[PDB]
Amino acid sequence: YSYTEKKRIRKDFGKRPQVLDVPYLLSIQLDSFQKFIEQDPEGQYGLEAAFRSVFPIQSYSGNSELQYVSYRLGEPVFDVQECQIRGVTYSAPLRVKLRLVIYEREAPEGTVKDIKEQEVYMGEIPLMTDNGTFVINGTERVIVSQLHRSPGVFFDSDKGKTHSSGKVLYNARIIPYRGSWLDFEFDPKDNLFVRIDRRRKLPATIILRALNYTTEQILDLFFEKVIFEIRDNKLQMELVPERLRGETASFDIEANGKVYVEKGRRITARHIRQLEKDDVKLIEVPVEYIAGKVVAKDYIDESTGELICAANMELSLDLLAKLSQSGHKRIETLFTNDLDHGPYISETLRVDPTNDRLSALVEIYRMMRPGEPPTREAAESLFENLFFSEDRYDLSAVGRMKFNRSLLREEIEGSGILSKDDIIDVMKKLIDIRNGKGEVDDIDHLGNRRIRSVGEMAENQFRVGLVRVERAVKERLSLGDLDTLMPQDMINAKPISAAVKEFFGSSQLSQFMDQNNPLSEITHKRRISALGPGGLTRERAGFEVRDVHPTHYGRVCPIETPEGPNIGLINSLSVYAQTNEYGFLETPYRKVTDGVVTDEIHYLSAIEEGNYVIAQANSNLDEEGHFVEDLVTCRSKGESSLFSRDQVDYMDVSTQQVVSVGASLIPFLEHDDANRALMGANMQRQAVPTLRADKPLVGTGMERAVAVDSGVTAVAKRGGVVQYVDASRIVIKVNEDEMYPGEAGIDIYNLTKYTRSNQNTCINQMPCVSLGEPVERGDVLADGPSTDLGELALGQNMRVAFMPWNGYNFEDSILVSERVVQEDRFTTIHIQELACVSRDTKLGPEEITADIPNVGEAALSKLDESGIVYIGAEVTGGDILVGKVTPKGETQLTPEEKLLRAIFGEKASDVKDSSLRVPNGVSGTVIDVQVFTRDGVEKDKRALEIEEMQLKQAKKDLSEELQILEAGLFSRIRAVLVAGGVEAEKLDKLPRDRWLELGLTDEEKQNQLEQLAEQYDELKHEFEKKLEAKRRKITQGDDLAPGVLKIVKVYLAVKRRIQPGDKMAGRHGNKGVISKINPIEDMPYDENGTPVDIVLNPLGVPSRMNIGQILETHLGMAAKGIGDKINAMLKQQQEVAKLREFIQRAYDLGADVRQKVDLSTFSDEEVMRLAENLRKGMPIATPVFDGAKEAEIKELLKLGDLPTSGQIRLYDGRTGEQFERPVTVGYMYMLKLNHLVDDKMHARSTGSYSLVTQQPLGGKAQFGGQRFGEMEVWALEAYGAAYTLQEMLTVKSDDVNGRTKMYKNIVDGNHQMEPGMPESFNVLLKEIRSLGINIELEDE
């Protein structure tokens, strides 16, 4: 165990030892984008792929061409720190080397004529952070991984297109990565059709003719052969015994010597073995049997030379006699069977109105380009271009892989283009399924739903940049002069830059990171969607997609999805789930070797899961051996039953792999309905971090994993002692073993201090380590906004009691103590950012001065001369943050204003007012202000005071860097010098600037002194250019929108307290509005006196079926009971040995506790720092399904000297008399949701008005009245209340006469109806007249 763990240990009730440790939760996002930038040498991936794919590009003539050489990423112009603040993309320069090669025309290919070569920029690509975010225009945004139909082949069947026929019509469909679609489909008459791009329906033999296949070859490919010999006079026929199988003997079947079956008799398996063992090959048959049979190949009369009967023609008696006397006593026919080998291509050819190859390419061309007269080349070029050109078509690796294994092929990896073989093979398996063998694939299987992360999508969007450049290259090359024109003159950098920023902005997958909570960040990065482009739609979405599929097991979470119309499509990834190298998902599984459950793990694909039988994690291992029980509950083939020991092949690794991150944090999930579990995990993401991070007493263990991997905390890169602790930063000295011998070895971690979130909340990093503390590698040094000693802290736990209270907990309504409000524990932080813009209007430029017309000295008190509020100035709604003034035009001073400005005076400067003032209602503390100015017009004085600090603070901060880096660098040299020339004080006489002057003997350590000496100089010279970059970027003027001159961004610090209307919940979906903050006098309390914090309604439990909250309560109480005992011993100031015995007795209680923590290993000092954190309550871990049971909880309650029941004797605070009977009391870890009432409440009397509808606007954002829709209207129609409605149609909405007239009447007191007729109808009249329709209002 580690030091940071020694400070506070979580009691783990797990009994299934973790063979696989929880992975980095942000694996997908980081590894995905890593592939995109990764310049692979050959195995093209990301950009390298994009270039080799499109390039080399050659002119339309083909005399000149552009060739890709190599590319590179320059370091970012502005780093994350800067980018987040300024407000422009955190992107890297793309420099690609191009080569313009030109050939000789009359000569063959003079490739060596002018090999021009240079490097060219095109577009700046947003980079990804270490958190898996993209900084777009100063916003850390997340690109959600997409879930789409995997390319290759797919067999489906509309179980009843025409329920008229009710025929299951089977269809096949080749889905490429790029290219046209290729579908084959049957019809009521079982005629095979082909519909390229699902366009026209064409007979399916027309595509085969296009691949040069004669009528004969076609038949010879699908159908078998039936041989007919006409010997002397008796007509004879070859019989494979296994053919007249499950059919009826239409004729008398007799052989060399025996009659087997009679006319009109079923030929059974007995009769088939009877014939097959007799080794029957030939049988004499009647001539009436051929009438109906289809002739296979063509048969020309040897004599004349004319076709007696063409291929694929139903024979007759007279045609057969015409063939017998022609001179053919060997006829080949089709093996037609209505049951097994079906005759489809046969009946299809009879519909097929085409003839040869060239004519088949015509109707294919007449489908897709109808109206253009076809030529030999246009018809051939089209068809060859569709599925047979390296340009148009690309199945890709996954496409060909799924395509091949769908056809049970030989190859995993093959060609991007469809070969003739592929097409016919597909038609073949479609016909196999139609016959009976072969099963259709289903889309809901994750083996067909591929995952596409950002890096692959960034690659795709980067291709369109290259495709849009391809156009401009070719056209400029051909007609443009060859020599003069340079390659960068033909390249454009905007089409690539615009096409990539299109993705990093407008796309549905690129959305603002939900970062109001570490859990929100990590679960939103692990979100996977089926929506946006190349996916599905709420309009298009069905049910079976949404439905949980047994493939989800271990791959996707069953209980993680919005309850909104985007319900089944959006889904989080499972805990231990990972992406298949091709695209599909895969889940860890413990291999079973010869019964022995081996610790070797194999990530089984969605495909191979179905193959092996998989035991559950419920199954018991024999401590290195096998399953203890002979029978094991297992699952396979998407079904579940008991199996024997040898039959088990694999097993679930952990018991948490079914669920996601969102769900792995819910304790006692096992005792919760999936409907409430979903809502609980959905609200846990909405949990605004509190003022003081409070650890959860009733956790799962996953707590630390989330907080750490979220990238919100600061964890140690190298272990050692914290040389310096500070609120702003942390300095740690590295140990000798880990420290590199070259550099000094002193890590710097400047902690992110209080600043804004995307949801307008607090972000802080407080040091969770003491000055001069020994820290191990990979330990949490600073905690985040919702984390505590590295563990996740989303909300706060408190003593809760389930019972009604005078209906203040009616429908899940919450009754919270004032004592919670007194501790300010659920009081939240909201850093709000407001801005002031100086624009350039037609009348003139605006500026920022304290000089504002029509103002009180009271308003300009908090401002300085420049016109910006001081840092630390408290502000309230109405007070002005930043003084702004714009030009006043030709302004018509109305007579009543010209006289009023002439009486009291103050002839306001021909300059309008528009100062940024605190929005009506908000009030907090200004923590900082940032000024952005165009590189030009002279600055404000406050803008100079801020430049003063940035500079002199950066000069100090860099001075501190080179100083401590110097001390750590000479600290090494001092130790090196002792080794050899041992002299202590005599060496430390003169100063340290003359230490590189001293050396050592010819030794490795003399080379070391030279490394550190010239590296000290390397830092000494580096320090100047580090200062240059800081100084310039502070002097640099910031590029703004056109019209804008300068901006001033203010940061406030609003601290909202909990109040009635605030929404809080547990993590079991138990929602609720705070109805009343009860007085401490009125709160119920136990015999001992301590009151309850929240009083919840017991009726929000049975109907909900989320008993996990009650177990959270019981354990929380037990856990606290133990903290209350430890709190008492630490207050009593007892002993180290007494605490050791009790705490050892606490950690060791569970049946088979996973963690067996001995305290004999802990030193006295390490025990007391532990107990001091255990006194608030012993933090407990209840794994998701391997959690604690009643036996363990009730045993813990006996250790806490708490009741076995969990119900306590409560007394009413109002009165003092006891309640009639006990109530459950305990500590439930509840949360404060983002839905706070200050951000909800709204009211309106009269305000803005809409632009054309002329009814009010919408929302408190724009100050708009509530909408009264038609449903709201019918309500008043039902009542009969006619004016109440007419009032809400006219005066309250449009009626321009009415609204103002009614206002004046109300202030008069005469609330009188004065209608006219809403504007929005007057609009509808003219709008119908604009459509050329006479709509006039016909009068009385």
Binding site: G371, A493, P895, D935, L1251, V1296
Partner: protein, 277 residues
């Protein structure tokens, strides 16, 4: 058959003369002297060349059908003014016209807010200068960075970049969710709500009461100067047209009316209360 306006026209040009060198001269020679039939032919014949010239001038302002129409107008002006006697071909001379007429018609019908050629022509060179810079600076060029390479004014570059700003549609959905457009948010500048309408009505009714509370010769001079009761807003000197006919006594009486009215606002409860306003 064919019901695409595109393919129909493209079919009818596919059955139109393809002229030789001496053919062009024969028709063109008669076309200048007005053969009527000749002018129709050379045009009909070279519609095919207009389409190949509009295949590179697309996706810039109008549609492909819109470019062919305005491209045809260039071929007509080329036929109105060709020189057959010159040994140089027609296809060469007509290309100069068809490329011009298209570019010009795109420069007008591309932008909603009409931009004449002068402001546009210049803007292009500023943008094409941004290309050179962007490739070698690897940084999208600023208004200054463009001004330093051309050695031209800063405001000009900025003024030309202010006319390159695009315009979003009012009916455009908001955030991958066609819930509300911009019209459902954008307020009406003109009419402020009854509160602001009744402010002026009540304020100006209170003034009608304050003018009847003053002297008869103090409201007759004060009102008719500001144009409150009178018809035209006159000045101290111009009040003499009515009956005053004074310059000193008009200025003493104007201010005497305002001084007694300042005490009427101190007593009713405004003065410094209504000074902030």
């Amino acid at each position: 058959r064919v019901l695409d306006a595109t393919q129909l026209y493209l079919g009818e040009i596919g059955y139109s003369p393809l002229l030789t060198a001496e053919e062009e001269v024969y028709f063109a020679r008669r076309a200048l002297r007005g053969d009527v039939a000749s002018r129709r032919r050379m045009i009909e014949s070279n519609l095919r060349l207009v389409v190949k010239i509009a295949r590179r001038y697309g996706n810039r302002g109008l549609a492909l059908l819109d470019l062919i129409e305005e491209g045809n107008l260039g071929l007509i002006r080329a036929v109105e003014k060709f020189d057959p006697e010159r040994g140089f071909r027609f296809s060469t001379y007509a290309t100069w016209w068809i490329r011009q007429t298209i570019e010009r018609a795109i420069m007008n019908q591309t932008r909603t807010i009409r931009l004449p050629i002068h402001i546009v022509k210049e803007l292009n060179v500023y943008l094409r200068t941004a290309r050179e810079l962007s490739h070698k600076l690897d940084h999208e060029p600023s208004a200054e960075e463009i001004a330093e390479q051309l050695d031209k004014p800063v405001d000009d570059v900025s003024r030309m970049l202010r006319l390159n700003e695009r315009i979003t549609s009012v009916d455009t959905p908001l955030g991958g969710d066609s819930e509300k457009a911009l019209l459902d948010i954008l307020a009406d500048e003109k009419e402020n709500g009854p509160e602001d309408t009744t402010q002026d009505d009540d304020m100006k009714q209170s003034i009608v009461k304050w003018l009847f509370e003053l002297n008869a010769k103090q409201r007759e001079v004060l009102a008719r100067r500001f144009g409150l009761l009178g018809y035209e807003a006159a000045t101290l000197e111009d009040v003499g047209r009515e009956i005053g006919l004074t310059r000193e006594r008009v200025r003493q009486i104007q201010v005497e009316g305002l001084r007694r009215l300042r005490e009427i606002l101190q007593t009713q409860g405004l003065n410094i209360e209504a000074l902030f306003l």
